[PDB]
Design a protein around this ligand. Structure first.
Ligand SMILES: [Fe+2]
Ligand SMILES: [O-]
Length: 522
């Protein structure tokens, strides 16, 4: 229960939101297919209510009994159908977890991460927090921001606890499953012993983490250190680098001064150095006082990759290498080529001739690239991994987790091939550029293949590709959703698990070992 003044404020604010902000500022102008929910949400992209744990899911084929863990997958799932204006990325975070051990699928569960934002929107039964891309990047964006801060002025909303949406991927670090938020602190999620998922709360690393960090921090296989970047779009140092030890101890911040505020979705790691991608997509907040998006692509700016020693004391140790006209949203892997002293970076990029309208137009390519950096000389190299015969769109993917920052010959990646739909996944030979596809079959689509390495006793440390791929699939002429189990080495289906409900499309997934799960403690 609110007030009597403020109860009557909220009433009037709602009426204003609808009769003015919506009806005057918004409804008379169309809605780009990139903020239009009928597009963004349509089909299997559409959200799904929580399934509390369902046990002994029906399995065909033979799940290898040695496999023992949880496959967990984050993604966007707007609790309430959004009032106009919404991009696929804007939605509430939801995790799907499937317990696997002894040839069994012990439990499927799916749950929202209980974000300060959702907790408040549940209270009212309505969206109230503005959509970041779909509302705030629009022309009404400023008005929308005012409507919110007006409501917040009447104690009707509280941004004070962060307004992140925790939908952009997961890591398992020092016994905690963390739900990654682009513009907020991580949320701690407890994988429950019954198979369920409970949101512990908003995680700042024991007092240490004060700002928002990027949603792709990298965990070194050897050191157990978790390496992170944070960018602040406002104050002087627009980019920090720091890490955490297994002791959960935080390093001193290494400031990376940049000329302007650069958006940085992802970065990469090597044995001894971090690889930061400084690209052309940039923050010009000015734009928003005009009808414009604050996220601009700066044609003028020169794309580059910084190489910085992991235990650096000062920014002066950073080595900037120009790679003109390259943007990559994700960097699968990077490694130190000892034979050259070069740094090899494997990711997937687009070479933008693009203008202002970022998406309402045509021809979006996204190409698996080998980028070679030679820090001392500053000259670089950029080639497509696949020959122009079997050039195929290869989206979100993974390299063997244990070989992170070391040289890997195989990558596994989404075959986005009726563009945004994923018809399969491919095993890639990053040296030779050969591939084999696993076709999902007619009318069936997925996303991020999760490679699980058969933890050990093969050679001694196993062969690079002695593992398994786990992907959710989704049948059209739709029955339910399955999770396949494919043998990474001979790229062959072995087990097929049916999920009770429907697993909607998602973002980054991860695999927690059984014995990894043991450390949980919360
Ligand atoms: Fe990502
Ligand atoms: O992400």
């Amino acid at each position: 229960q609110l007030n009597l003044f403020q109860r009557a404020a909220a009433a009037a604010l709602d009426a204003f939101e609808e009769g003015f902000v919506a009806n005057v500022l918004e409804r008379p102008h169309g809605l780009p297919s990139t903020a239009d929910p009928a597009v963004q949400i349509a089909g299997n992209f559409a959200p799904v209510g929580e399934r509390p744990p369902v046990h002994e899911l029906p399995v065909s084929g033979r799940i290898p009994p040695f496999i023992d863990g949880v496959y967990a997958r984050n993604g966007a799932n707007p609790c309430f159908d959004p009032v106009a204006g919404h991009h696929l990325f804007d939605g509430d975070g939801m995790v799907h977890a499937l317990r696997i051990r002894n040839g069994a699928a012990e439990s499927y569960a799916c749950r929202f991460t209980e974000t300060a934002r959702l907790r408040q929107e549940r209270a009212i039964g309505r969206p109230v927090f503005p959509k970041a891309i779909g509302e705030l990047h629009g022309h009404s964006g400023i008005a929308r921001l005012a409507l919110f801060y007006a409501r917040a002025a009447c104690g009707l909303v509280d941004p004070s606890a962060g307004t992140g949406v925790a939908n952009a991927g997961l890591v398992y670090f020092n016994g905690r499953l963390l739900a990654m938020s682009e513009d907020d602190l991580p949320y701690h999620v407890r994988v429950a012993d019954d198979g369920d998922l409970e949101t512990v709360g908003r995680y700042d690393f024991d007092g240490q983490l004060g700002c928002a960090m990027i949603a792709h921090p990298k965990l070194d296989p050897a050191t157990g250190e978790l390496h992170a970047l944070s960018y602040d779009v406002i104050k002087r140092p627009y980019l920090k680098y720091f890490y955490f030890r297994p002791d959960g101890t935080k390093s001193d911040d290494v400031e990376i001064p940049l000329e302007q505020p650069t958006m940085i979705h992802d970065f990469a790691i090597t044995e001894n150095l971090v690889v930061v991608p400084d690209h052309q997509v940039v923050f010009k907040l000015q734009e928003m006082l005009r009808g414009g998006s604050p996220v601009v692509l700066d044609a003028a700016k020169t794309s580059r990759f910084g190489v910085l020693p992991k235990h650096a004391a000062d920014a002066s140790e950073m080595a900037w290498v120009d790679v003109p006209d390259c943007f990559c949203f994700h960097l699968w892997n990077a490694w130190e080529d000892e034979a050259t002293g070069e740094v090899v970076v494997i990711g997937s990029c687009m070479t933008p001739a693009d203008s202002i309208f970022n998406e309402s137009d045509e021809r979006l390519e996204s190409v698996l690239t080998e980028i070679r950096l030679d820090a001392r000389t500053g000259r670089s190299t950029r080639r497509a991994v696949l020959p122009p015969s079997q050039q195929v769109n290869l989206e979100v993917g993974m390299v063997n987790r244990n070989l992170l920052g070391r040289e890997t010959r195989y990558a596994y990646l989404a075959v986005a091939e009726p563009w945004p739909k994923v018809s399969g996944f491919a095993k890639v030979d990053l040296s030779t550029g050969e591939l084999t596809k696993f076709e999902y079959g007619e009318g069936r689509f997925g996303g991020e293949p999760c490679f699980v390495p058969m933890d050990p006793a093969a050679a001694h440390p196993r062969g690079e590709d002695d593992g398994y791929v786990l992907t959710f699939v989704h049948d059209e002429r739709a029955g339910t959703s399955e999770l396949l189990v494919v043998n990474a080495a001979d790229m062959r289906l072995e087990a097929t698990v049916q999920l009770p409900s429907r697993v909607p499309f998602g973002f980054h997934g991860t695999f927690i070992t059984g014995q990894e799960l043991e450390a949980q403690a919360a």
